[PDB]
Amino acid sequence: KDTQAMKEKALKDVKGQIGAPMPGKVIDIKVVAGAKVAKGQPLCVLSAMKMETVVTSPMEGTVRKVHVTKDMTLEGDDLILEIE
Amino acid sequence: QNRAQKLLHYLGHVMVNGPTTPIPVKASPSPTDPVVPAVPIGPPPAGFRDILLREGPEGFARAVRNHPGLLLMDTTFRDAHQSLLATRVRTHDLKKIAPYVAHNFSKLFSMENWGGATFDVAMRFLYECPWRRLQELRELIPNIPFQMLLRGANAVGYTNYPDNVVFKFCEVAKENGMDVFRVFDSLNYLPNMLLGMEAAGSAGGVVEAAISYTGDVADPSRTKYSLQYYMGLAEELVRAGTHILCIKDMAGLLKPTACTMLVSSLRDRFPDLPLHIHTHDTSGAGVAAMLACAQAGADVVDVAADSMSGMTSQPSMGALVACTRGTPLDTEVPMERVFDYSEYWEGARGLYAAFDCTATMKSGNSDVYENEIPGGQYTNLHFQAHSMGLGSKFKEVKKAYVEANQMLGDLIKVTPSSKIVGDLAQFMVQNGLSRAEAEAQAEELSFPRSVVEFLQGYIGVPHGGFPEPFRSKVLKDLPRVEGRPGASLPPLDLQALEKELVDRHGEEVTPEDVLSAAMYPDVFAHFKDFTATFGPLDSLNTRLFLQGPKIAEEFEVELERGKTLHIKALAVSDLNRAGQRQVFFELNGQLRSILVKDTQAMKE
Amino acid sequence: QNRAQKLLHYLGHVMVNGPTTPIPVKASPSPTDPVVPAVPIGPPPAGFRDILLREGPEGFARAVRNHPGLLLMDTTFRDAHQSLLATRVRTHDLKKIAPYVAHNFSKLFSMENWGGATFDVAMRFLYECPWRRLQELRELIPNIPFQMLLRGANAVGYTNYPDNVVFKFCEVAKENGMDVFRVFDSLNYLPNMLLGMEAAGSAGGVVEAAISYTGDVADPSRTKYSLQYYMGLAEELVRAGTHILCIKDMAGLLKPTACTMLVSSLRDRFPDLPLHIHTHDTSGAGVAAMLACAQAGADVVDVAADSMSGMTSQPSMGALVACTRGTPLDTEVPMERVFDYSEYWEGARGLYAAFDCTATMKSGNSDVYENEIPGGQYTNLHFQAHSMGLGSKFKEVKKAYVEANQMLGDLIKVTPSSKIVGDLAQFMVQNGLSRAEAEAQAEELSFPRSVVEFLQGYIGVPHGGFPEPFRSKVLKDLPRVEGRPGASLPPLDLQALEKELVDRHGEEVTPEDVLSAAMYPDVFAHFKDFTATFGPLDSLNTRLFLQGPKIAEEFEVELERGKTLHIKALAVSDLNRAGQRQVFFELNGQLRSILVKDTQAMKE
Amino acid sequence: QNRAQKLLHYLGHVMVNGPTTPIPVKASPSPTDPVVPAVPIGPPPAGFRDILLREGPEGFARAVRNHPGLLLMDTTFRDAHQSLLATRVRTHDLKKIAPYVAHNFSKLFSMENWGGATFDVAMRFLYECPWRRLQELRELIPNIPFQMLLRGANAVGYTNYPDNVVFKFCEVAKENGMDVFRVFDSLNYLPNMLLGMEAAGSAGGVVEAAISYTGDVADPSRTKYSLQYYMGLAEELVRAGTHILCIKDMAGLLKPTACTMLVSSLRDRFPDLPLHIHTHDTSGAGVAAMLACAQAGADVVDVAADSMSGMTSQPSMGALVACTRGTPLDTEVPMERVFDYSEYWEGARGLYAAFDCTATMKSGNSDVYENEIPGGQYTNLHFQAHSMGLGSKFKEVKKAYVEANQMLGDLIKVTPSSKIVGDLAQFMVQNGLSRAEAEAQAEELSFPRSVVEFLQGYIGVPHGGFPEPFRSKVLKDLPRVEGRPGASLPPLDLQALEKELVDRHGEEVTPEDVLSAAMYPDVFAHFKDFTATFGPLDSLNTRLFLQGPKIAEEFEVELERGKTLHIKALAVSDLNRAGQRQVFFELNGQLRSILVKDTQAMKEKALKDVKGQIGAPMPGKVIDIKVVAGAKVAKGQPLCVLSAMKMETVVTSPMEGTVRKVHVTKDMTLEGDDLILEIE
Numbered sequence A: 001k002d003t004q005a006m007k008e009k010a011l012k013d014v015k016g017q018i019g020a021p022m023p024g025k026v027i028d029i030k031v032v033a034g035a036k037v038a039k040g041q042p043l044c045v046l047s048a049m050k051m052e053t054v055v056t057s058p059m060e061g062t063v064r065k066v067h068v069t070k071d072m073t074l075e076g077d078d079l080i081l082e083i084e
Numbered sequence B, C: 001q002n003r004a005q006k007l008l009h010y011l012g013h014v015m016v017n018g019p020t021t022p023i024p025v026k027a028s029p030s031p032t033d034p035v036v037p038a039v040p041i042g043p044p045p046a047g048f049r050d051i052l053l054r055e056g057p058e059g060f061a062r063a064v065r066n067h068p069g070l071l072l073m074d075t076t077f078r079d080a081h082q083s084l085l086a087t088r089v090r091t092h093d094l095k096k097i098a099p100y101v102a103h104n105f106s107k108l109f110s111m112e113n114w115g116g117a118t119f120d121v122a123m124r125f126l127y128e129c130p131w132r133r134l135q136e137l138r139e140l141i142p143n144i145p146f147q148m149l150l151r152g153a154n155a156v157g158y159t160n161y162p163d164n165v166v167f168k169f170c171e172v173a174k175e176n177g178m179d180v181f182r183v184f185d186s187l188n189y190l191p192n193m194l195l196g197m198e199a200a201g202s203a204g205g206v207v208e209a210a211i212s213y214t215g216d217v218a219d220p221s222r223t224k225y226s227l228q229y230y231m232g233l234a235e236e237l238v239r240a241g242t243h244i245l246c247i248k249d250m251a252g253l254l255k256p257t258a259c260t261m262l263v264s265s266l267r268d269r270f271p272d273l274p275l276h277i278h279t280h281d282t283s284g285a286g287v288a289a290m291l292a293c294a295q296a297g298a299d300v301v302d303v304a305a306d307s308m309s310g311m312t313s314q315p316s317m318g319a320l321v322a323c324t325r326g327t328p329l330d331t332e333v334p335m336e337r338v339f340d341y342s343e344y345w346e347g348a349r350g351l352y353a354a355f356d357c358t359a360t361m362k363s364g365n366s367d368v369y370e371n372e373i374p375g376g377q378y379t380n381l382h383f384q385a386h387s388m389g390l391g392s393k394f395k396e397v398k399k400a401y402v403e404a405n406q407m408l409g410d411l412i413k414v415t416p417s418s419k420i421v422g423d424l425a426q427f428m429v430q431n432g433l434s435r436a437e438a439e440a441q442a443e444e445l446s447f448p449r450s451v452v453e454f455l456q457g458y459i460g461v462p463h464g465g466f467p468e469p470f471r472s473k474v475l476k477d478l479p480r481v482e483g484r485p486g487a488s489l490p491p492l493d494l495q496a497l498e499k500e501l502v503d504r505h506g507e508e509v510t511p512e513d514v515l516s517a518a519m520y521p522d523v524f525a526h527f528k529d530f531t532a533t534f535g536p537l538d539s540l541n542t543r544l545f546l547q548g549p550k551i552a553e554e555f556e557v558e559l560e561r562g563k564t565l566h567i568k569a570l571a572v573s574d575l576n577r578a579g580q581r582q583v584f585f586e587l588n589g590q591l592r593s594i595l596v597k598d599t600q601a602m603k604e
Numbered sequence D: 001q002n003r004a005q006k007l008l009h010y011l012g013h014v015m016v017n018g019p020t021t022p023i024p025v026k027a028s029p030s031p032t033d034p035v036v037p038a039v040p041i042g043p044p045p046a047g048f049r050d051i052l053l054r055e056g057p058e059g060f061a062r063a064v065r066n067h068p069g070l071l072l073m074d075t076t077f078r079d080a081h082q083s084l085l086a087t088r089v090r091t092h093d094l095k096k097i098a099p100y101v102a103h104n105f106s107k108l109f110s111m112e113n114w115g116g117a118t119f120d121v122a123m124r125f126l127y128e129c130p131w132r133r134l135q136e137l138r139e140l141i142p143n144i145p146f147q148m149l150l151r152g153a154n155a156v157g158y159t160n161y162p163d164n165v166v167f168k169f170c171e172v173a174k175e176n177g178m179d180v181f182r183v184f185d186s187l188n189y190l191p192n193m194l195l196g197m198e199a200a201g202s203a204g205g206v207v208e209a210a211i212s213y214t215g216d217v218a219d220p221s222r223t224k225y226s227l228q229y230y231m232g233l234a235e236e237l238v239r240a241g242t243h244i245l246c247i248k249d250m251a252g253l254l255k256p257t258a259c260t261m262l263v264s265s266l267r268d269r270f271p272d273l274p275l276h277i278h279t280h281d282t283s284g285a286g287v288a289a290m291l292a293c294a295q296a297g298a299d300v301v302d303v304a305a306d307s308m309s310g311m312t313s314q315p316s317m318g319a320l321v322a323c324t325r326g327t328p329l330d331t332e333v334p335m336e337r338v339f340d341y342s343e344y345w346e347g348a349r350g351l352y353a354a355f356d357c358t359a360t361m362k363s364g365n366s367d368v369y370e371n372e373i374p375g376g377q378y379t380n381l382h383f384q385a386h387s388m389g390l391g392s393k394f395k396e397v398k399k400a401y402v403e404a405n406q407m408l409g410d411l412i413k414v415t416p417s418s419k420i421v422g423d424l425a426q427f428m429v430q431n432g433l434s435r436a437e438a439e440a441q442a443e444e445l446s447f448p449r450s451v452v453e454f455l456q457g458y459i460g461v462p463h464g465g466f467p468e469p470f471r472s473k474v475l476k477d478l479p480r481v482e483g484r485p486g487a488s489l490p491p492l493d494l495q496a497l498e499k500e501l502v503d504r505h506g507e508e509v510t511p512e513d514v515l516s517a518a519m520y521p522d523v524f525a526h527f528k529d530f531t532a533t534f535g536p537l538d539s540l541n542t543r544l545f546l547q548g549p550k551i552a553e554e555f556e557v558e559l560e561r562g563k564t565l566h567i568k569a570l571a572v573s574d575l576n577r578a579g580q581r582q583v584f585f586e587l588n589g590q591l592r593s594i595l596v597k598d599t600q601a602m603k604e605k606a607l608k609d610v611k612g613q614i615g616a617p618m619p620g621k622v623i624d625i626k627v628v629a630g631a632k633v634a635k636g637q638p639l640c641v642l643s644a645m646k647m648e649t650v651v652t653s654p655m656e657g658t659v660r661k662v663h664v665t666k667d668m669t670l671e672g673d674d675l676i677l678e679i680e
């Protein structure tokens, strides 16, 4: 673990998690941290090269926490949400 | 003291923060200057302007119809870069080759160098005055006629404005030295075209009514946009009085057999009416299609300099010239002349790497026949998918474009109809919606702005009507536009608007600025606002403009009004208290500095 | 695990030192995987090869003539990438869409997939056996005829070969799946193309004699490569007994009327003969030209997938399929399949960004009519000529490529003729010599090898001979040829090479290798040395082959079916005393590292 | 002001090329400035110089002798920093507390502030005039006597100078404010001392003859340098007519009993004679040894400011003052004053981090008892073994030093003799020669320059003699010096040297200068040439002098009698092709730029066209060498086979005749027009 460079974000990989498929700005705070997410519900909206994207879901259960803010730069896999 | 100051503050602001304008592809302006050929001193040879001003539009028209061999129009100064380089070409780079065109292309039917998106972006992304471009070119080319593209009822833009605005726009355009007005409407809505034609006509200057082309004429099993549709449309326009009739094929959907079928029929019906034809090369058949047009007896065809041609551009100027040597159809245009012209543009295009479509697009694509996306659009939507995405997200968008099209009634797709269908397309892919799913849920989905406005009547009436299964559900009784939008739309106070702009902008308001404000209220505000801070930027070369100078190289500024600034950029300091850097210049042998804020105290 | 140690060794070598082969344009292969369409199981539809196999070349010739409508050769597997991507396309990528081509293109006359520069480049740069490529695509495409480009006596090289080698080359090619041998000679020198013809005849392949085309047949004043010039040559080839006659337009010089002239006066001079017409699109007349050939009753035309066509390549297969619908000439190739094939090739094309000509060349150019530079060569000069000292004012290269033409007796510029003209101009570049300061300053100077060798008659006699006063002083006592190079050339001892190769380049070696080593003595040497060090890389993914793995990024590489290697690159160490870096990998969950040599840092 | 430009050209040269002086430790100065205690506005209290001026040296020595309690001489301004900070302390920093010492330290016997290493170090490294420093300090300290260290015949350099120049040195030194001349000779060699004494004598200053100390006088078994040895030597110097007598313990070798034994006995043979004892603290026995001297009745003791004491410097002032109170020895110096004096120096020291010996030396070392390296040498040799090399290679240097000392016949080691021993030690290690092995080979060894000059007697005759079987077969054919060197050395002109200084360095040349050029011909030359380019820099504060200004930092500077200069460094550009950088300053709010040269970037195959020579036709690898290197050629005959890729060029020649040399052999890539052959 790099403590020295733990002062950040996150890109949370393989297991059932929510990241950015497109590199863009963060616009939305749709779901509450701890709210019911049944069907394929929108959660987040990105904006790139004159574009806008709707962040998918196909996952059942409850949201852990939002990691994104507003007007946030997003890098790669990144940290939008977390479902269990 | 301010003038070179604002100029050094601009050049400084670039060096420290980078281009002030959006840089879509992350590449740098080419380091090698464009080769301008030698040009004879004195007057250019007789053109067609020498016959227009004297004999009048109807005489010009006659001379054109009588000219045995094939005539051409150069689109390099407009439609060409509007498709290949995002309309970014600046007045500076246009002027450098204007003299060469006057002296060597006297034989051109006309020269498209204005209208379409040039007006819009010159002010939005270039901070050049679109009118200044017009007059300065006009002063450098007396002999060849100037053609512009007029979006029928709305002049320049994508939304119908009051009728006086269009009628005055043309008056002024003509007085500033525009000759041929190519007038079209996205829907082929005859009332919207007539509006344009009248505004152009009554302003003096040649009226070229442009029929927008969709479908395939040589395919009889397609009945909506059939030969009998276009004939009849063309009937109505000729009856309404055209100087030159144009077939406008914005998407490159015009095949050879479909050509000679249509051109033969227009020649059938009107033996002595000048036919001007325009295509794009997206399908890879442009040259063949124009040669088929020429042979069926069309008078004029459009081309761009080889090095600014192909793909979503016009067919190669050289190809058209070459293929008619030793033919009754001969262009009589000397090939050396096209070589040197094309080689100028090879250099100029170089300067515009940041906007070059060949970042993503390496060739044309015959699938236009399926998707019907116009050249210009194809480039933008292509870039949007390949650039940020993973390549094959484009297949989905255009197969949703196809659906949006027949969803909205099977439309003719030019500006703004293509924006409308494209806006419906990108809507259906933000939410994984079938044509069948989306129109079964048409009642509530709350579609985008331009779609609801289209379905209301804001751009007029499509041939065939509106899709009434689908459209009523979207609208939930909103105020649908009755007749032609123009008349039922009170006139805009040009007098009032004059004074309105003055109390903040000043006494330095020419009547041209007014029409600019009338067309684009906001981007003209932001244009002057920028010009207020940095001065007129259209005198610099494009490398300097786009990327600023580089440390240690002396360069002279072609600053107008007869005074030359010698500048050598020396050094930028590192950041201070107030998150800025200090830029060091030599200015006419004097040591000078200014402060520019680094946008990094802006980033945390 | 020792076959995998070598793989790791290669992947480290790329990671440390950049790509092994010269990469001209400093760009990366795209991160997007090319889209391959789904294909139905079981056999493909029956193609022309079934008529060939069951009826011999004689029947195939007849069947092609009897097919009323226009037949096509897809050229994407060879010429298209030789022109646009410096012949770099690896087998891996060809093999992928091969099942698709098999199932969806049975209607093709043939597919060009071998010979030309692909032989040299495959071994020299791609470290692949070209014989493998042929056999492996053969197993995947049983129904479409394969087509080669053989340089006559020049074979797949740059100078003339002993008869026994050229003959033997065609035999084993036949036995590896070669169906059609397209035969041409750079100088149109009759005896030389008669050699390659019988050597192709003996093998039992379809013999396609090709007249190389220079000049303008439609131009009366050009009294060197006249309409009658070609007519004379054709009569001889038909009388020599070719199965199919081809016109090879290497530089894209055919204009629509020049086609109409030549193919009609050929059809009307040999009613029974299949006419195969080949062109490049560098001038932008390619489609129109080819459509004129079809109209004048050409049996077959050459095209390339849309995304691999245009500019210096072949004409769009989309366009000829499209422009031919609803016409006697209908190709009957479905448009939806043309889209898919092209779409795959866009994906593939991106993997080759570093070799893509469009980084410097953004369009075709009409000035081929001036510089007569062939498709392939118009790429390999400012994109290339990087090896000899880059490009710097390329205009001057060309304007002396034009002088070089007249300088060597005004020639048919193909391979290896054009190479010799392309070695003389580059020579004049770095030595800064004008044509006037060369014809006289001839004896007191030393030109390249290719020039000296051509002048003494190594690759044949040009039409009208050499330009004597110049020819004399270059050669100065050097021995001249005596007629047909092959005639007076001693046969190469192929059995003594056999035992050499076995004693040297590994033990058990194939007869194909003998023919590689014959064609290219030490390009084969360097190739066998490489694979011995690094193993067989043809199995490897292209992005993987060209730039290596992404650090931390897990991937799969199956060393040809059988086994699955899950690999992940981990880190690269600092430099050790011996100038090496250690490189760490995960191999099937197991930690593995190698010692590689850092080129840059190795100079002690 | 062309001399504002000269200031800037220097400041720019620093911040482009880094610390312009040799910078031994990779460290920068403190971002803090020394605390100067508040001072009274009037004239200072009357000190000893008032007595000296009124009574002469003979009177002054009486006043010293009669003072009941102990008198101190502060060495912070000279010896302290010579040991601790490679003598690097500049006039600027000394001037700052000059007013403070004047007012608060009137009781001091004298105040060592000149001579020894300061003379060349000022010019050689600090680029300032040592006379200017003396002069300026004299206007600042009217009341305390000044003291210098004078190396007898070697005056202020490292060998014997012509008689006349040594006398004239003392005259102009005296004339400048120099009161007390401490006069020693590295070998306690009387003639050289008498010379030094009558140089200072006839110049009018207080003469302090100084016996150099080695061995252990308390140790009966060590006969060579006995209490008798030293006793016989003082008696000579007293006969010669000294004012004060000094014991110079340069290595810190003096322990309590030995002091008690020596000073008490010197008090016996000379009842009322002022005894001035000087030691170094490098064995850790400095304070104690001095208290012993106090008790045995010494009149003056040498100390340094606390923050400049311990280790190889003098003993702590604070300690002697503290351990002396409430006794007849009492210095009567208030502790508050000592604290404050030291606190300034704690801060000043901080500026000299680049030169602080403490970077590798954190303690004294009792092994001085075995090796006997004087204070200054110890630390300026210890550094040499932990800095440019690492660690224990100093051990062997010390082991060789011990051996070298006895090789040269057991010597009193001070400058220059100590330098000699250290030069022979370095030599023996520099090529692995053990003592006995060096002895046998000395016949043809070729030793250092200073060692062979010594054995000729350029520096004189040591007590005992020259270790004989050695001396003879080193020199073998070289002139020796009999007796005193200065005796044969012709009186050096000082007016034909004046003419040259008028020539090389313009008209405005003082006589002070003359003696410097006499002392250090080449150091003075390099000195005067620096102050030509960059002007006088003795006015900058030390952080600015050594390190340059920080970017954006707004700072103040005055140039000797000229008004204030507000300055800001703004930026320093990239490199132009000439290898220069442009440096931008805000001068007086006005923007100014300077071109300066980048040293670090100053240290940054042939073609022949229009001649009979032959250049390569294309850029290519050489696969064949055809013509034998220098042989005949014919009409159009192949010479070289070149190959880039797919392109080859068989190199021909119409030029006939002989061939010169062959340039390239085999392999590596050759450029476009590159070197192949000449033909006659």
Ligand SMILES: *C(=O)CCCC[C@@H]1SC[C@@H]2NC(=O)N[C@@H]21
Pocket (backbone or CB within 6 Å): C116, C117, C120, C121, C124, C374, C376, C377, C380, C414, C415, C416, C417, C418, C419, C420, C422, D646
């Ligand atoms: C070398 O690496 C491959 C040869 C590339 C040159 C090609 S071969 C075919 C074209 N004709 C010619 O003379 N040069 C082009």
Ligand SMILES: [Mn+2]
Pocket (backbone or CB within 6 Å): B079, B249, B250, B278, B279, B280
């Ligand atoms: Mn258009």
Ligand SMILES: [Mn+2]
Pocket (backbone or CB within 6 Å): C079, C249, C250, C279, C280, C375
């Ligand atoms: Mn070809």
Ligand SMILES: [Mn+2]
Pocket (backbone or CB within 6 Å): D079, D249, D250, D278, D279, D280, D375
């Ligand atoms: Mn001392």
